Subunit: 253 residues, 6 copies
Amino acid sequence: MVNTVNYFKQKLKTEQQIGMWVGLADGYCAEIAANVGYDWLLIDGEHAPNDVRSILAQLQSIAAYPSQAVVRPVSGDVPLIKQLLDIGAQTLLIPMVESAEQAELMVKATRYPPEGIRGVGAALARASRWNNISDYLQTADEQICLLVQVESKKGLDNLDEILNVDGVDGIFIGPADLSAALGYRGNPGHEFVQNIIVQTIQKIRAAGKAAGILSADEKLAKQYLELGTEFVAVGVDTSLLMKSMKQLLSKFK
Amino acid sequence: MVNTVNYFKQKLKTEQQIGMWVGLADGYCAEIAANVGYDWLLIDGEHAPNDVRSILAQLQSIAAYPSQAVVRPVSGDVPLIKQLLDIGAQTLLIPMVESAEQAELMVKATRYPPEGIRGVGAALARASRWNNISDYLQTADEQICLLVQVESKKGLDNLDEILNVDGVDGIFIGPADLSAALGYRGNPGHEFVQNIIVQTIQKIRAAGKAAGILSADEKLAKQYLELGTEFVAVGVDTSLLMKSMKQLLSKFK
Amino acid sequence: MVNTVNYFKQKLKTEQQIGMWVGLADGYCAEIAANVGYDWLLIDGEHAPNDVRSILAQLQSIAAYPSQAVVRPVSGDVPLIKQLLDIGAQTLLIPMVESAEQAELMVKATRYPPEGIRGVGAALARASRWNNISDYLQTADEQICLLVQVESKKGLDNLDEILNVDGVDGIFIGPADLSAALGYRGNPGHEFVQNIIVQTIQKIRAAGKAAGILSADEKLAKQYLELGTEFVAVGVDTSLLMKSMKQLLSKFK
Amino acid sequence: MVNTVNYFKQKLKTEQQIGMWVGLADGYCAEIAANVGYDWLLIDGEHAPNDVRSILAQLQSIAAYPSQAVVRPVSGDVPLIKQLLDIGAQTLLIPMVESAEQAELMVKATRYPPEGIRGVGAALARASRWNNISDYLQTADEQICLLVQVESKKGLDNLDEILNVDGVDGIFIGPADLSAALGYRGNPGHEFVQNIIVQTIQKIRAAGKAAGILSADEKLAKQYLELGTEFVAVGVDTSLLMKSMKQLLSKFK
Amino acid sequence: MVNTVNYFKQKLKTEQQIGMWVGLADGYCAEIAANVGYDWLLIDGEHAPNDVRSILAQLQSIAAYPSQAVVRPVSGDVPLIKQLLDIGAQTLLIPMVESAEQAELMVKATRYPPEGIRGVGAALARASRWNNISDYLQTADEQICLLVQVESKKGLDNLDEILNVDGVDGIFIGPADLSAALGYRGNPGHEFVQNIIVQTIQKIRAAGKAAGILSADEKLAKQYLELGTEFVAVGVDTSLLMKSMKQLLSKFK
Amino acid sequence: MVNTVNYFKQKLKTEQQIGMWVGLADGYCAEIAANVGYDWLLIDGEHAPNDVRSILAQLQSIAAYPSQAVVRPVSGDVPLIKQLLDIGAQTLLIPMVESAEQAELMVKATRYPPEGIRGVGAALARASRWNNISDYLQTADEQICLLVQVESKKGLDNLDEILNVDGVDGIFIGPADLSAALGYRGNPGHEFVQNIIVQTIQKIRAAGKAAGILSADEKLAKQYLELGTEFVAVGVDTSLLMKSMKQLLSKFK
Ligand SMILES: O=C(O)C(=O)C[C@@H](O)[C@H](O)CO
Ligand SMILES: O=C(O)C(=O)C[C@@H](O)[C@H](O)CO
Ligand SMILES: [Ca+2]
Ligand SMILES: [Ca+2]
Ligand SMILES: [Zn+2]
Ligand SMILES: [Zn+2]
Ligand SMILES: [Zn+2]
Ligand SMILES: [Zn+2]
Ligand SMILES: [Zn+2]
Ligand SMILES: [Zn+2]
C-alpha cells in the first residue's frame, strides 16, 4: 500500500474547495455528511464535543468517500497534534495562532524528527495502516497539510510574520472569534470587520499561501470565492439540522 | 414525585400533534430535535440503529423539553416492550400489527399484572425514577399510550377487528410499508394507495381512535391534517440533514 | 488454564449465599459492588438497561473479585442464552418460567450438543478464554448453573413439574412479579402472598433444589435465611444509591 | 449514486473467495482486518459480543477497503435481519437453518414486499445512503446475498429441500456445530465428520449453489478449496491474536 | 428561547445551597442523583473518570431536574474550560488555584472577547442550543459562575489577592488537598487544619465572596453551614454507594 | 483490603520481565492479551487511540490476571498523571523525558503532598477502591512505579542527570523516537543507533536503575536480555494481529 494522497493539500494550488463544518461529533452523522459531495469536511475538535476516539470514528466513516477530512484540535497542543496525526488525520486546522514562533512550532509538530518533533509510533498508527504502508516514515511528511487560524488582533498583528513561515500551507480566517476580538461580537457582517477580512484574504494570497474562511452567509461565501479564497466552508451540520427542522415545523406551527 | 403526565396521550383527544421522526440514533442529535418545538418525537428503534441503551440516552436528552417522546420498537416483542417501558418510554408505536389478537397482546404487554403481562421491576426503572415516584405501580398504566401500525394487506384485512380493541389508543398508517405491500413500492403518492389511506384514516376516526401518519410531503401532510388526523409526523431528521447539506452544496457545486 | 470453577453452583449445596442486585448497568458501578464482599452479584439484563456488550463489561470488572456473577436475561430466549454463556456468564437466572417443557428447553439451551442446543463457538468466546482453556468444550457443561424464576400463577401451577426437571439447579421466587400476578401488586408483604412464598420455598427444598429470593426487607430476608433458602439477594444498587442520597439530604433539607 | 455492487455475490459464480472471521467486535480491529486483502470478512453477530450498533461501526470501517462484508446474525430472526440490512449489510450468513420452510422465510426476510417481508424504511437506512441512492427501493433486492448454515443433523436431514430453495445463494457448513451435533464435539477432524462434510460440499455444488466452510486447519482449508468450495474462511482474528502473542512469549518464557 | 438562568449563581447571595458530589461518571447515575433534590451536583472532571463527552451526557441527564450542575475540570486549562462552557456547563469549579494572576486568567477564560478569551463557537454549542438562544453571545457572560479552589499553602499564601479578583464568584476549600498540603494527609478533622478552614471561610465571606466546602462528616458540614458557608457539598455518590452496600452486607455477613 | 502490591516494581530488582505493547485500545482486546502470561502489558496512551475512560476499561479487564499493567500517558502532563493514578494505574511510562528537572516533576506528580503534587481524591478513586483500601493515603506512594523514556538527543544529553533523580525507578529507551532523533528514522537496526542503545543500557544499570526497551526483533530483544535489561517488551498487539492475518492470507493468496 502507498500512503493516502492528500488531495486537499494538492487542490490548495489548483482549485477552490467547498467545505462543510462537521460538529455532530458522531461516526453515523459524519457518514451522512460524507455522502453529499463536499470537497472537505472539518471535524471540529474545538467547538464540538469530540475527543481522539470520536474523531477516529468519523475519519473511519468519511474514509470510504471522496470528501477530504480536516481536523481542528481544541488548541495548538503538540501531544494532541501527535495523537490526531497517528489516527490518520492528514490536514489539521490550528485555532488561535498568534505568532511566527507558534506557527513554526505547529510546523515541527506535524513533521518527524530530525526536522520536526512529531512522536514516532508507526507500528500503532492507523496513519501507517499499522505499517501496511511499508515506507510511511519516509512518505508521511509530504501528505500532511498544516492550516493555521488568524482570528485575534495579535494574529493580525503578526500576519506578515506568520505568512513567512515555511510549512504553513494555509491561513484560515475565523469570523466569529475575529469579530468578537474586534469588539463586534456576533456581528461579523459589519463593514469594519469585513474590510479587515478582505484585506487579510488579499495579503494571504499575495504571500503565496492558501486563504480559507467559514461563512453560512451565501452572499459573503460567494464574495470570498470571487476573491479567489482557496478553501471556503459554506455551512455547519448542527446549524443546517436545527434550521431545516425549524423551517419545516413553521409550515404547520 | 407524581408520575410524568403523558400529554401526548391526553392531546390525542384535544388537538392535532405535529411530529418529527428521530433516526440519528444519538443523545446529542435527539436534544437538537427536542429544541425545535415539535409536539412529539418518534425515537425509531425499527429503522434507525438504536438499542435500549441508545433509546435511554435519547429519552434523557428530550426529557428537559416539552416535546413528548414516542418510541418505535423493532417489532411487537413483549420482553423488548417491557425494557422500553422500564427506561421510561410512555408511548409505544408497534410496527406491522395485523390482527385483533396481536393488538390485544400489545395492550397486555403495556399493563402490569394481574390485568396485563408487563414485567414488574419498579426498584430498577427510570420509569418509576427508582421508586422516587412512590405510587408508580398504581399510577403507571394510566400514563402509558399504545399506538399500532396498520401497514400491510393483512392489517387492512383486520382493521375493523383492531379498531375494536380496548387499549389501542391510536392506529398509525405507514405509507412506505403499505405502498410496498400493495405493489406500489416507492410510490405511496399513487391514487390507488392514497384512496386506501384516506378511507383507513376515516374508519379509524369513525371507531373513536386517534389516526396517525408520516409524510415528508407538505401537501399530503396538510391534506391528512385537514381530514382531522390526530398525530402527523411531517419529516425525518436523517432526511432533513441530507437534503439541507445537498441543497447548500448545489449553490456552489 | 483450567475452566473457571463455578463456586456459586457448588455453594448451592454447602451454604447460604448473600446476593446484591446490580442494575446500574455499568462496568465501573459493577466494580464498586464487587469490592463489598457479596457471595453473588445479579447483573440484571431484564429490568436494568443492559445488553450483551454492557453485561460483558460488568463480567470483566467483577472477574478480579471473589463475588460470583449471575446474569438475568430479558427472557428465556435460546439465542440470547448462547450469547451470555459465550461472554462467560456461568450462572443464569431465567425470568417467568411457567412449565417443565420451558425449564427443559432452558436446560438444553445451557448444554452443548449432542445432549443440548448451546451453539458451539469456543474460538470466539471469553468463556473458553479464546481456547486458552484447552479442554473447554469437554469441561464447560459442569461449571454452568441454571436458575429459573417462578413468579406467576402458571409458574405455581407447574411448580411440582418444574422441580422434577434435571438440570434446574435452583428455583428463585420473584416477589414483585408474583405479588402482582396474585392481585397484590406493590404489596408482597401481605400474608396471602407471604404464605405462598414460604410454602413455595419449602416445596423447592423438599425436591432437593436450591431456593432463592430477593427482599430489600431485612426482616423478610432474615426469615427466608432461617427457612434455609440457599440464595438470598438482600438489596439493589439503584435502590441503595437513591435511599443513601435521600437520607443524607434529609439531614440538611 | 448507484447501489453498492455486491462483488461477493457475483464472485460466488466466478472464483473461490478467501475469508477471515471478525470476532473482535470493534470498528478499529475490523479496519486492521480490512487492510490485509481478504476477499470477505465475516462480522460475527452470533459468537462475538456484537449488536446492531457495533456491527454498523465495523461496516463503516471496512467500507473504505475492497474486502466484502458478510454479517452473521445471532439467529434467523426476521426483525434483526431487517435491522442488519438497513445499516447496509448486503450479505447475511444465517446460523442453524434446518428446513426448506425456514430457508424460504430467510429469503423473504431479505426482499421487499410485495414478494418479501423486509420492512421498508429507506429514508433512515445507511443501506440507501438515506435515499442518496435514489432508486434503492428498485435496485436493493439484486445486490443482497443470502447464505444459510447447515450445521445440525436436522439440517443434513433437510439438505436436498434447502438446496431446492430459490433465493439461497450459498450453503455454509459449520464444522464446530456439526461435529458436536454428530457426537464428535471438539473433534471435527474425525473421518466420520469429514466424510459427511465432503459429501455435503459435493451435494451443494451439484444443486448449483455456492458451498462454504470455515477451517483454521491449513490442510483441511486447502482440501476444501481443491473440491471447488466457493467461500472458505481460513482463520479467526481472536484465534490469530491469541496464538501470535502466545508463540512470541514462548521464545522468551 | 432565553439563556438558561444560572440559579446556583443567584442563590450564592440569597441562601445556603446543599450539594452532592457526582463521581459515578455516568449519564444514568447522574440522573439518579438529579432526582433526590440537591441544590447542586458537582460533576467531577478532576477525580472521577470523566471527559467532555461523559460530562455532556451527565448535563443532558440532569437538565430535566431543578438541581444546578457545577463541573470541576481536571485543571485550570483554558481550552478545556472553553469545551465545558460550550457543552453548556454554566458553573465551573477550578482546582488548585494559587494566585490572583491564575484567578484573573480563569475569569477571562469564562468570558467572550473582547473582555475575555473564551473561544467563540455558538453555532455548534449546546450552550447556545445551536443558536436557538438567539442573543446567546450577548447574554452568556451574565449566567456563567466561576468558583476557584484554595487547597494548597500557596493558595492560602495568596488568599487576600485571590479574594480581590472581580469575576471570582466563590472560593471553595478542598479539605483533602489542603490537609495533605499542611502535612496532615487523610486527617482534615485535626484542629490545626480545622482552625485554618474556619479562618479561611471567615476571610472569604468578609471580602463579599461566596464560601464553599465538601465534608461527608455531618457534624463538620453543619458547623460550616452555621458559619454561613454559601455552598456546602455533604456527600459523594461513590462513597454513599460503597457504604450503603457494605452496611447492608454487615447485617447478614 | 490492603493496597494492590506492585509486583512489576518489586521485580525490577529480582528478574527480567517480558512485556507486550497493548495498542488495540479496547477492554476486550486487553483481556485477550492478559490471558497469554506476559510479565507486563503496556497500555499505550501516547500512540494508540486511548483516553482515561478506555484505559480504565483495559485496567478492569487485565486486573483479573497476573500480568502487571503499565500505562503510557500521551506526555508528562501532571493533571493527566493524576487522572491515570486515580483510575488505579500503579506503573507509568513517561514519554520524551529530557532533563533532571522534568524527571523530578514526574516523581512529584506521582506522590501525595506534602512531598509530592499528586491531587488528593481517594473517596472517588478506583486506586483506593473508593476507600475500601482504608489506609490508601498512607500506603499509595510505596506501590507506585515511575519509568521515564530517554528517546531524544536532549534526553541522552541529560542521561547522567536523569539517572541521579531519586524516584525514577527505570529508564526505558524508545528505539523508534531515538533512531529518528539521530537522523536514522525507520532504521534503529543501524550500528550507530545500536551502539548508543547498548552504552545507554550499560549506564542505566551502572547508576542502579532498571533499564527497559521495546523491540519486535527477536535477535535484538534477546541481546538486550543478555545485557541484563530489566523490562523488555518483545512485540505489539496491533503488529502481531496484522502480521498473523497477512501470513495466513499469503498461504492462499
Ligand atoms: O520506540 C519508541 O520510540 C517508543 O517509545 C514506542 C512505540 O510506539 C514505537 O514507536 C512503535 O512504532
Ligand atoms: O463451525 C461452526 O459451527 C461455525 O459456524 C462458527 C465458529 O464460531 C466456530 O464455532 C468457531 O469455534
Ligand atoms: Ca449497545
Ligand atoms: Ca471518550
Ligand atoms: Zn474560531
Ligand atoms: Zn413501516
Ligand atoms: Zn420478576
Ligand atoms: Zn456454527
Ligand atoms: Zn482538591
Ligand atoms: Zn517513543
